[PDB]
Amino acid sequence: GAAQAPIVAGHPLLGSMNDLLNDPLATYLRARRDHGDVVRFRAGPPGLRADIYAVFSAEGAQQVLATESGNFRKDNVFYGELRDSVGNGLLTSQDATYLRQRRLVQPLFTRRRVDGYAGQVADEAAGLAEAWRGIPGGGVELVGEMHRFALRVVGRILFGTDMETTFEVIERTLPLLQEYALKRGLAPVRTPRTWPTPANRRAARTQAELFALCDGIIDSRRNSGEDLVTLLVRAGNAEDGSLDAAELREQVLIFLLAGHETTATALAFALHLLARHPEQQRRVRDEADRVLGGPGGRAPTAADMEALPYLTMVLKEAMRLYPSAPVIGRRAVADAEVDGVRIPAGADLFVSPWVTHRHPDYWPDPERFDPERFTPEAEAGRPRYAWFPFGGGPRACIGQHLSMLESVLGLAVLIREFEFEAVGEEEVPLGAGITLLAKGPARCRVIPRS
Numbered sequence: 001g002a003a004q005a006p007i008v009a010g011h012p013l014l015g016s017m018n019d020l021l022n023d024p025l026a027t028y029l030r031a032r033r034d035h036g037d038v039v040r041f042r043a044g045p046p047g048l049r050a051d052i053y054a055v056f057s058a059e060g061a062q063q064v065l066a067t068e069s070g071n072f073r074k075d076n077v078f079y080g081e082l083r084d085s086v087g088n089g090l091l092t093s094q095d096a097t098y099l100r101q102r103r104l105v106q107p108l109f110t111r112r113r114v115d116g117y118a119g120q121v122a123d124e125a126a127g128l129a130e131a132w133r134g135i136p137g138g139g140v141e142l143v144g145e146m147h148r149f150a151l152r153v154v155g156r157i158l159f160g161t162d163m164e165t166t167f168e169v170i171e172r173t174l175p176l177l178q179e180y181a182l183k184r185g186l187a188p189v190r191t192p193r194t195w196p197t198p199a200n201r202r203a204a205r206t207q208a209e210l211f212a213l214c215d216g217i218i219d220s221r222r223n224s225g226e227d228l229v230t231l232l233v234r235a236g237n238a239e240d241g242s243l244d245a246a247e248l249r250e251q252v253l254i255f256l257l258a259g260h261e262t263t264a265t266a267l268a269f270a271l272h273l274l275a276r277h278p279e280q281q282r283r284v285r286d287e288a289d290r291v292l293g294g295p296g297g298r299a300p301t302a303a304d305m306e307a308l309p310y311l312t313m314v315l316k317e318a319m320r321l322y323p324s325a326p327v328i329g330r331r332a333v334a335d336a337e338v339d340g341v342r343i344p345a346g347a348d349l350f351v352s353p354w355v356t357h358r359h360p361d362y363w364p365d366p367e368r369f370d371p372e373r374f375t376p377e378a379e380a381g382r383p384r385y386a387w388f389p390f391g392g393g394p395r396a397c398i399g400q401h402l403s404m405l406e407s408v409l410g411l412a413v414l415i416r417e418f419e420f421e422a423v424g425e426e427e428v429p430l431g432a433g434i435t436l437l438a439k440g441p442a443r444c445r446v447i448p449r450s
């Protein structure tokens, strides 16, 4: 006896089109508050787009992402636009194509291989510290600062040293190809990319430049402290052979796309919360000072992650309030039942870390910043999928441990060398694209500790 999904209140004629455009994050929370855990969003005018379903329960998220993963596919139009824009890499691939890619890439994402990149993160963070030590204003805009820093960390991990050259090209090329794909995947009309419109021409020129850069970097590595491009080029097994040149580029691009804004968002918001919460900052500082030796102390290592649990708890709470992926899209193959509600075959649907992380059934006083929610005991008192920023199940984030290594060890250096104080508006307005979008500045004063 499957129930029908309630339609989220919206415009009499346009449905949720205006609400999802103006304030999608507030629309998602209202949908749960007024209509429940399985809802349907209507578009207008009638006949433009099929109803998009939404699952906000932890148990429904476990079903969509893990228990019944086979019924929920990456067949949404957005995924097709990303594949056309950056190639059919590990994030967008499905079936046999994905299985061969997973067989060849998983070896590069082992805890030991990832832990080997700890010194690169520590060096990049010490570099940011020296630059911040010479800021005459003593102030930073964290969204902008962490956007640069995160690309530098993932790019050092990918391409090694002296790649500020490649950084500036990627910095200006990749975001445009992502916007092109996001805007087309969410659009109600799609003129072919071959069509010679000014926008489609600009995107193909952007693609050419980035593709050629990637191919040159990859071809230089065709000729341990090895970079990830070197290990992707040397990936091979008996059944799958090795990755081709197009396959190599698709993975480099997907790693850059999946690790640049995601880690930036987490770093900026963790630092912003610590800037607005002095007691929690003092706790992270006393922990950093005890493990690394204080201002002017030693570089953090991968093993220091076990000795930095409050910082880990601050990060998880930042990713609860500010999930870098606020929604995860899927498409139903066959009729399904989630929380007693029917999700039809062919239906585009989405789980939302943004809503489930603020759900009153799992989160007391959900908008309060409290790292103590992530003690092992508190985690046991709540369902597993109440917190899922890296997703879950077979398609969970492969760089989850890398992101935590870069965040914990990164923030450890910055808190060991600087005190943070929020300046100006502390409420950063938020939107949603591929990732959580900052629609406001996160200003902060950096005070050198030595």
Ligand code: HEM
Pocket: 090, 091, 092, 154, 254, 255, 256, 258, 259, 260, 262, 263, 266, 323, 324, 325, 328, 329, 389, 390, 391, 392, 394, 395, 396, 397, 398, 399, 400, 402, 403
């Ligand atoms: C070092 C940084 C990162 C890298 C290189 C990276 C890479 C990737 C890759 C390759 C995938 C596809 C995994 C697969 O299908 O087998 C993925 C999935 C995912 N990543 Fe990450 N990631 C990083 C950081 C983050 C962070 C900080 C978040 C925080 C929100 C995040 C959230 C996700 C989510 C939700 C998925 C699942 C998407 C889905 O199921 O459709 N990633 N990541």
